[PDB]
Amino acid sequence: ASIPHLILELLKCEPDEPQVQAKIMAYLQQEQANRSKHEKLSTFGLMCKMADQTLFSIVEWARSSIFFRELKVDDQMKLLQNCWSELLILDHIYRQVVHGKEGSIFLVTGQQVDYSIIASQAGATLNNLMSHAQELVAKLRSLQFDQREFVCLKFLVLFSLDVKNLENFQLVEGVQEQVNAALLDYTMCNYPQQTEKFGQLLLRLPEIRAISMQAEEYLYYKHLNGDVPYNNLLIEMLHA
Amino acid sequence: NALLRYLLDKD
Ligand SMILES: C=C(c1ccccc1)[C@@]12CC[C@@H](O)[C@@H]1CC(CCCCCCCCCc1nnn[nH]1)=C2c1ccccc1
């Protein structure tokens, strides 16, 4: 376990997985129980609530890093609005790579859900996106995707170089290249069998980005049709 | 976005 010091500092910002799982599941089915039998939530509304809680967790993880904390709130906002759906999709993909079997989806609540039971309730776009996500899960598991690479990918997504109109763009540039060097060293060291594993890891970022943009546009158009509940962080995210 | 600003300004 030869881990660079930067990767350890980045791992130090990882939230407690079982704690957040219990919090999210309790909040979710309690908000359920706070209605009676036929004023209950849709499955789509359940997933919206799950994504909202996961976005809260993403925000509290992002403000857990000094790199992000030392930026002015405007640049923090710009970063998060550029990268929030990408962080969501990447977190789901990593959860599938770790806890997932096959034939089922593992949720942020800690639930193993039958894959066909979910796929039969989703439309064509959501089914295609979930299929592409499972594809990337399989391709990453064939590469032995671990936690440190996942952390560095999170920090690379949070500090994208495509964000314009920033005050401290140089900070984002420096953090980007620091994480690049650290992750490159780590994976080329602890995984010498697959020379190309670093390029293979970096190649999948545009795919998660495109899936993120498609899902974000679908959710925006759906909430403009009223299918997403309110009093939300996801709403304010789409309302931008 | 005011809710995100509130969250990030909670310090
Ligand atoms: C971004 C996500 C999200 C998806 C739907 C609503 C809200 C959020 C997540 C990300 C992690 C959790 O937050 C979300 C859970 C998830 C799995 C998909 C299950 C939802 C399909 C069933 C309802 C059909 C209703 C319907 N309406 N029209 N068509 N189907 C996700 C996902 C994973 C990979 C690709 C795309 C989505």
Side-chain angles (χ1 to χ4, degrees):
Chain A
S2 322
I3 308 155
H5 281 188
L6 176 53
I7 302 194
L8 303 154
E9 298 296 321
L10 300 181
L11 286 151
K12 279 189 210 188
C13 312
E14 284 304 284
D16 194 20
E17 196 187 63
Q19 203 195 119
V20 78
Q21 290 182 340
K23 288 187 65 177
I24 294 181
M25 182 101 254
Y27 162 89
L28 252 73
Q29 308 277 20
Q30 175 259 39
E31 290 305 323
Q32 202 74 304
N34 260 23
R35 307 142 192 247
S36 315
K37 189 192 149 272
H38 218 118
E39 47 260 33
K40 285 317 200 303
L41 273 163
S42 184
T43 300
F44 186 76
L46 274 170
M47 302 291 104
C48 288
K49 289 299 195 185
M50 256 172 41
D52 203 64
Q53 290 297 107
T54 316
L55 282 178
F56 270 104
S57 180
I58 282 178
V59 163
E60 77 194 6
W61 154 87
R63 70 195 329 263
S64 199
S65 159
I66 302 315
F67 305 129
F68 196 79
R69 200 79 132 83
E70 78 192 64
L71 293 171
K72 57 136 52 166
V73 182
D74 273 87
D75 299 323
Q76 313 177 9
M77 265 151 29
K78 302 189 192 175
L79 293 200
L80 273 169
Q81 315 168 327
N82 175 70
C83 75
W84 66 272
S85 64
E86 214 176 355
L87 292 175
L88 195 60
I89 299 303
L90 174 69
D91 182 81
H92 164 78
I93 288 172
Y94 178 73
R95 178 171 306 107
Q96 294 319 303
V97 158
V98 179
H99 296 63
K101 228 155 96 189
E102 290 296 41
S104 57
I105 287 185
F106 201 74
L107 301 187
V108 75
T109 55
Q111 298 173 281
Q112 211 195 17
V113 177
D114 196 316
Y115 186 87
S116 39
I117 297 322
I118 282 296
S120 51
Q121 308 177 51
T125 312
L126 254 59
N127 275 333
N128 286 344
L129 287 192
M130 288 158 43
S131 183
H132 206 161
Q134 295 302 321
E135 261 168 49
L136 295 190
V137 165
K139 186 51 189 172
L140 286 181
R141 230 210 313 274
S142 99
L143 255 59
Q144 311 154 251
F145 196 58
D146 57 30
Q147 197 195 13
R148 292 119 277 265
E149 302 155 333
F150 165 64
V151 168
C152 277
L153 286 192
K154 282 176 70 187
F155 264 88
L156 285 182
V157 168
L158 175 57
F159 290 80
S160 158
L161 286 185
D162 298 303
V163 186
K164 305 313 169 199
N165 283 207
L166 289 171
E167 187 214 312
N168 223 337
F169 57 104
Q170 320 195 256
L171 193 148
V172 182
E173 210 157 12
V175 170
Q176 253 274 337
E177 272 309 323
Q178 287 304 124
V179 178
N180 249 333
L183 182 57
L184 166 60
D185 214 10
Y186 167 84
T187 70
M188 193 78 69
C189 198
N190 299 260
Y191 303 93
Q193 153 87 256
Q194 31 206 338
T195 39
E196 64 283 76
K197 182 184 182 184
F198 180 72
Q200 294 313 120
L201 285 182
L202 285 205
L203 249 60
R204 311 282 179 258
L205 289 185
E207 310 198 39
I208 301 176
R209 178 73 167 182
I211 291 171
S212 295
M213 295 307 105
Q214 295 196 48
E216 192 178 333
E217 221 51 46
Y218 197 90
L219 290 182
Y220 180 70
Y221 289 138
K222 270 277 161 175
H223 147 66
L224 265 41
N225 305 348
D227 298 27
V228 183
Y230 292 87
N231 289 82
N232 265 186
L233 183 47
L234 175 77
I235 291 301
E236 311 276 39
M237 285 307 160
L238 306 158
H239 212 79
Chain B
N1 204 325
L3 181 57
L4 184 57
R5 188 179 305 264
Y6 165 79
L7 286 177
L8 292 180
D9 270 315
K10 254 211 61 185
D11 269 16

